[PDB]
Write a protein that binds this ligand. Structure first.
Ligand SMILES: [Mg+2]
Lengths: 81, 81
């Protein structure tokens, strides 16, 4: 299990690094990205929307990795807690 | 968000190391610890059950750290997904 966790943690670090780089390049905060994606915030002028496909994919990867880590953690539950 | 995640990842590595040490001292696999805690495996003789108090505390901390990450990830939901 700890082998599985360590691999996922490494992948999460990588995913975070990618997202931070993409946000830096896009000149956008993570918060603003989410608000734009959900339809609440207008695209700021200056921001290149062409980054959004990759950002979306990487954010989905991060979510999936966190979910996968939690699935491993289910093996540590005793009596479901 | 990302500063929080980075700290949690570091705390998870620390927690894992602490558990590995306790398991080494106890001469117990993580798998066996869980099997014994859940009632499925008898206490092997030679194993000092006194280790179970700290092992349980540290495994609880590891679970709570992973849960903290789960909760952070909830902020990345868009349209509830
Ligand atoms: Mg094991």
């Amino acid at each position: 299990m700890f082998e599985k966790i360590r691999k996922i943690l490494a992948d999460i670090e990588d995913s975070q690094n990618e997202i931070e780089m993409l946000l830096k390049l896009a000149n956008l905060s993570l918060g603003d990205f989410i608000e734009i994606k959900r339809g609440s915030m207008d695209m700021p002028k200056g921001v290149n929307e062409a980054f959004f496909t990759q950002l979306s994919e990487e954010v989905e990867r991060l979510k999936e990795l966190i979910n996968a880590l939690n699935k491993i953690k289910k093996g540590l539950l005793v009596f479901g807690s």
